[PDB]
A paper describes a structure:
[name] excises uracil from uracil-containing DNA to concurrently form a covalent bond with the resulting AP-DNA. Our earlier studies allowed us to propose a reaction mechanism of [name], which involves the formation of a covalent bond between H109 of [name] with the C1′ position of the target deoxyribose sugar concurrently with the uracil excision from this site in DNA.
Furthermore, based on our structural analyses, we suggested that R184 in the DNA intercalation loop (motif B) facilitates localization of the target U in the active site. The [name] mutation (motif B) supports the role of R184 in substrate-binding. We combined [name] and [name] mutations and measured the kinetics of uracil excision. [name]/[name] mutant showed nearly 2-fold increase in its Km as compared to [name], and about 4-fold decrease in Kcat/Km. These observations emphasise the role of R184 in binding of DNA substrate with [name]. In addition, our biochemical and structural analysis of the R184 mutant shows that R184 is critical in binding to the DNA by establishing multiple interactions with the phosphate backbone in the neighbourhood of the uracil in the DNA.
Residue numbers in the entry: -7 to 207
Write the structure that this text describes.
Amino acid sequence: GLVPRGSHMAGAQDFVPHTADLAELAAAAGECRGCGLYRDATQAVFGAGGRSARIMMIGEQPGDKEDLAGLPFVGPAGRLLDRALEAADIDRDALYVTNAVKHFKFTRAAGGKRRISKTPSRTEVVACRPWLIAEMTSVEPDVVVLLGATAAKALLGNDFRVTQHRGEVLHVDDVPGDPALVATVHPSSLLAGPKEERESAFAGLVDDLRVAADV
Ligand code: SF4
């Protein structure tokens, strides 16, 4: 064909430039129309960090605060994650942090105090995955921490259950570079609930971060 058929016809793939440079990738994501989420979001929120990072962390999506900060993990969940990283003795300079989808999907409720996140469909996750693959091949992390169900399923499969594999180092044969994978609870889940449950859950997140950092 004058123009061939191929992966560039699906999802975000044709918006991803043939460069591993994270600044160029982030600039290009600002123009992505790979699914419908770019329309109502303020901006794309690419990952943050550098290519020497040994640990990559992936959440679900930018939330209300991130959508306007332009940066991942800035809101209350990000502050809880910072507390856990510090308890786990993990250097922020060793991290590249991002999300399975790069545009905030949301609604409002009258009387609300924030835009309410809505779950990306598996269709949206698969559409945005080209960016995640670009990030992973750019950074070459030794280990990927998957924060919550959307991010864990993005790499481990749509049937994967975070709740059934806590503490475990995983490897799957179609992830570029074959990094270790550790799936854990998303920090937003630890913000609410009875104290004893939040405290036990926090300790478990610190444990999983420490497993990842010991890879
Ligand atoms: S969520 Fe991902 S695939 Fe969809 S428009 Fe945004 S960057 Fe592109």
